[PDB]
Amino acid sequence: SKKVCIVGSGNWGSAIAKIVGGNAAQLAQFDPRVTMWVFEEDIGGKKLTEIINTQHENVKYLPGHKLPPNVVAVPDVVQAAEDADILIFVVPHQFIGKICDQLKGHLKANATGISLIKGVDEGPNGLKLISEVIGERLGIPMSVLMGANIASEVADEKFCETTIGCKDPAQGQLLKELMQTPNFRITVVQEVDTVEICGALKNVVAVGAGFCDGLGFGDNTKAAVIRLGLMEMIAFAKLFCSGPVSSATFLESCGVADLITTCYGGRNRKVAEAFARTGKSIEQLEKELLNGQKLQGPETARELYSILQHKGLVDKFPLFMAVYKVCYEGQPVGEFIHCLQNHP
Amino acid sequence: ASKKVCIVGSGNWGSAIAKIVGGNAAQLAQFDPRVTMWVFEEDIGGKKLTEIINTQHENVKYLPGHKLPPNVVAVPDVVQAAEDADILIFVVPHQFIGKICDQLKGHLKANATGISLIKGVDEGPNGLKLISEVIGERLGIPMSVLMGANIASEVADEKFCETTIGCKDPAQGQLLKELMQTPNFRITVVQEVDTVEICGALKNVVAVGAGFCDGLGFGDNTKAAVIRLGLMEMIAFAKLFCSSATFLESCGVADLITTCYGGRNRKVAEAFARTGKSIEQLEKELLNGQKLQGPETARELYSILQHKGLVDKFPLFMAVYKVCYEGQPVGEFIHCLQNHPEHM
Ligand SMILES: NC(=O)c1ccc[n+]([C@@H]2O[C@H](COP(=O)([O-])OP(=O)(O)OC[C@H]3O[C@@H](n4cnc5c(N)ncnc54)[C@H](O)[C@@H]3O)[C@@H](O)[C@H]2O)c1
Ligand SMILES: NC(=O)c1ccc[n+]([C@@H]2O[C@H](COP(=O)([O-])OP(=O)(O)OC[C@H]3O[C@@H](n4cnc5c(N)ncnc54)[C@H](O)[C@@H]3O)[C@@H](O)[C@H]2O)c1
Ligand SMILES: [Ca+2]
């Protein structure tokens, strides 16, 4: 039976722990002992790992939810992963570099991985998919899980779906059995890069959606911004992804559904509304409303402008490039509409 | 020669369209500035609605707070309203269009053309019959459609949005584009009329489902999954009762989004789930004469799918039908999504 290690214990990692723990305790093909690597913290005199292993509640990152008793918190990441056939990577992108340094050399020979990390790394073609970063560093085949999946709602067992991107078909099916429940439904698609690139690009669209909200517009306008954005994400994937790219993938939960949710609510939408209404800078708004964190939407747009410059294709992505110019070239946020309005 | 336009209908969307078409017809030489609008007569405060429109230039009941262009003239007799028209815009709730076509049969100018804005379906010998086919066969005019993410109140406020014109004749499509398009109302002409019209009709069924989930307290993950799964069933329905690309137009994805977030079907479905009052009672109390289109479309869909022996393949469509018409408890709606063919 296959052993599972959840690498990460935050909001989403704990929500995922509820699903994986519950399936591993019921399904014969998985070992019921699911390890979860927990970055140790002092929670009013008690180690967070001890809290998880005695109270079965991540009181800091998923308070109010019982974790399945078979999920074991492990404060050392090598000890968490050394024995696992399946590694679920679910940490903030900032920390995956360090985690992978500690793990290289210490994994089982046929270990496989699935990344839940939404975002994008750096490399030769400008961007590099995070799952390729992990896989190359650690030498393991990689899958991805991406969808319209807010962690608090998943923890509450409110119905939702998600996309598993996995090249190997038996692996995709194995991962579906691990993570699917009556209220967390899974589609397995044999693409990885197309599933994964939506998670980065959607935040660029969501900044533009926020500008439109900040300008007084409503649902019809947001719907056009999502529609044109989706078209630019499809075209961009076809330019950027190594392999074949079909439009249909973008209608999976990783594409259109996660795009809809992010454009109706989220950090990128909220800050971009504030930017359009208060004229304050993104850096200022990050400090005043995100406690100094980098908003990924504007940063990805700037990265897209560099790629398109390398390819000679800036003029074919007006919505992406309008987000870029409003965030970083001082274009007035009213001209963002002028671009929706003189589009093709 | 210039073309004369008749708007057949005067509701929430009817009146918003009269604002657009009235303004374009007054500024463009190829359209006679005199646009007639057939207004089903109503006694309002001792006065005729047609006379309120022709004196006050506003449809105070169905589009309050907006002035209609004074060149738009309300007309109570539909034959008189259409008699001299080259272009007829059909925009009435789908339950009335049959009767109106019987009153107009035989009385139209020799080479008249039509465009249907009506979001519904009908039934015929091939199972599905499109409303544009009903109109066109019964009146003997060629038919186009206009469908998109077009909440009428926002269009009337000149908030930016898009729509899709479906038209087989490219010259005719260009003419209708000129008639309808404004700097805040952008039009794409495509030739796949049937698919455009099906999208418009079926999205209101999905929106009833969406409203049910809002009313039971599911959040955005569930709404996004209802939207996405609704889109999959829409695509499967088109493939059977009619290509992917049309669903990326405004009439597909965009309209599904705007409707499941801000339409009248969604709002009444939510109240139904929260209050247990009936659709019919809620329609009368909350929409002040405006008409739901989704529940009836859901009934007709079930009948169409029954005759192709395909009911069981469309569980979301059928879940909406059975809650609205067969007394299935709205608490059970979601269970219809937990075994959907998309995740099999
Ligand atoms: N939270 C959601 O609703 C949600 C939903 C879908 C996807 N995601 C994605 O999952 C990934 C993680 O999201 P999250 O909600 O768990 O974030 P989170 O901020 O709640 O994660 C808490 C994490 O902090 C990590 N951490 C803190 N300090 C650390 C340190 N010095 N070294 C190593 N790790 C440290 C811990 O490993 C812990 O996993 C993100 O990429 C996000 O894109 C989140
Ligand atoms: N309202 C919107 O936001 C919107 C947007 C796009 C498309 N549509 C679609 O437009 C079509 C018409 O919708 P609407 O908003 O203009 O109408 P509506 O929902 O406002 O209904 C009001 C109209 O119903 C008419 N009516 C009532 N009883 C009648 C009767 N016995 N006989 C004839 N007419 C009667 C009235 O003349 C009134 O004008 C529908 O298919 C709708 O799905 C609506
Ligand atoms: Ca009908």
Tab-separated table of C-alpha atoms and ligand atoms in Angstrom, chain B residues 9-15 38-40 42 59 62 91-94 96 100 117-120 148 150-153 204 264 289-293, ligand 2:
chain	number	residue	atom	x	y	z
B	9	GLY	CA	-41.240	43.983	-27.303
B	10	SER	CA	-40.766	46.572	-24.571
B	11	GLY	CA	-39.597	44.928	-21.315
B	12	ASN	CA	-36.451	45.261	-19.295
B	13	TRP	CA	-34.300	44.204	-22.294
B	14	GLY	CA	-36.757	45.507	-24.909
B	15	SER	CA	-36.438	49.023	-23.472
B	38	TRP	CA	-44.518	47.406	-29.910
B	39	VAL	CA	-45.616	47.833	-26.268
B	40	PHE	CA	-48.223	45.419	-24.932
B	42	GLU	CA	-50.928	48.240	-19.635
B	59	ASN	CA	-40.627	52.930	-19.626
B	62	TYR	CA	-39.682	47.931	-16.834
B	91	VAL	CA	-37.366	40.681	-27.791
B	92	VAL	CA	-40.345	39.369	-25.745
B	93	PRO	CA	-40.366	36.686	-23.018
B	94	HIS	CA	-40.299	33.340	-24.792
B	96	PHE	CA	-45.392	35.025	-25.711
B	100	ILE	CA	-47.185	37.428	-31.506
B	117	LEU	CA	-32.987	38.287	-28.717
B	118	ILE	CA	-35.182	35.687	-27.017
B	119	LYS	CA	-33.544	33.301	-24.518
B	120	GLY	CA	-35.567	30.114	-24.681
B	148	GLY	CA	-24.448	37.824	-24.741
B	150	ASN	CA	-26.165	41.591	-21.194
B	151	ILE	CA	-27.941	42.360	-17.903
B	152	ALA	CA	-30.312	45.050	-19.204
B	153	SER	CA	-29.924	47.533	-16.330
B	204	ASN	CA	-30.648	30.421	-17.628
B	264	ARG	CA	-33.130	37.472	-12.301
B	289	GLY	CA	-43.838	42.141	-14.258
B	290	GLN	CA	-40.535	40.797	-15.568
B	291	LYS	CA	-40.415	37.147	-16.546
B	292	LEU	CA	-38.231	34.224	-15.554
B	293	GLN	CA	-36.993	32.177	-18.492
C	2	LIG	N1	-33.896	41.587	-18.894
C	2	LIG	C1	-32.494	41.230	-19.231
C	2	LIG	O1	-31.558	41.583	-18.567
C	2	LIG	C2	-32.271	40.437	-20.467
C	2	LIG	C3	-31.049	40.526	-21.107
C	2	LIG	C4	-30.815	39.791	-22.256
C	2	LIG	C5	-31.850	38.972	-22.751
C	2	LIG	N2	-33.064	38.883	-22.121
C	2	LIG	C6	-34.059	38.061	-22.712
C	2	LIG	O2	-35.034	39.070	-23.489
C	2	LIG	C7	-36.195	38.460	-23.645
C	2	LIG	C8	-37.288	39.447	-23.195
C	2	LIG	O3	-36.922	39.829	-21.875
C	2	LIG	P1	-37.295	41.273	-21.297
C	2	LIG	O4	-36.322	41.723	-20.232
C	2	LIG	O5	-37.314	42.408	-22.290
C	2	LIG	O6	-38.842	41.105	-20.743
C	2	LIG	P2	-39.302	41.206	-19.187
C	2	LIG	O7	-38.703	40.030	-18.415
C	2	LIG	O8	-39.031	42.537	-18.626
C	2	LIG	O9	-40.919	40.999	-19.140
C	2	LIG	C9	-41.697	42.158	-19.266
C	2	LIG	C10	-42.528	42.146	-20.591
C	2	LIG	O10	-43.356	41.140	-20.637
C	2	LIG	C11	-44.523	41.699	-21.587
C	2	LIG	N3	-45.722	40.929	-21.366
C	2	LIG	C12	-46.285	40.581	-20.190
C	2	LIG	N4	-47.385	39.866	-20.453
C	2	LIG	C13	-47.506	39.784	-21.775
C	2	LIG	C14	-48.441	39.185	-22.554
C	2	LIG	N5	-49.623	38.426	-22.185
C	2	LIG	N6	-48.326	39.244	-23.884
C	2	LIG	C15	-47.287	39.890	-24.463
C	2	LIG	N7	-46.348	40.501	-23.713
C	2	LIG	C16	-46.479	40.435	-22.353
C	2	LIG	C17	-44.727	42.927	-21.236
C	2	LIG	O11	-45.110	43.762	-22.443
C	2	LIG	C18	-43.395	43.413	-20.620
C	2	LIG	O12	-42.803	44.380	-21.366
C	2	LIG	C19	-36.141	37.189	-22.749
C	2	LIG	O13	-35.955	36.034	-23.434
C	2	LIG	C20	-34.885	37.396	-21.895
C	2	LIG	O14	-34.327	36.048	-21.517
C	2	LIG	C21	-33.297	39.619	-20.960
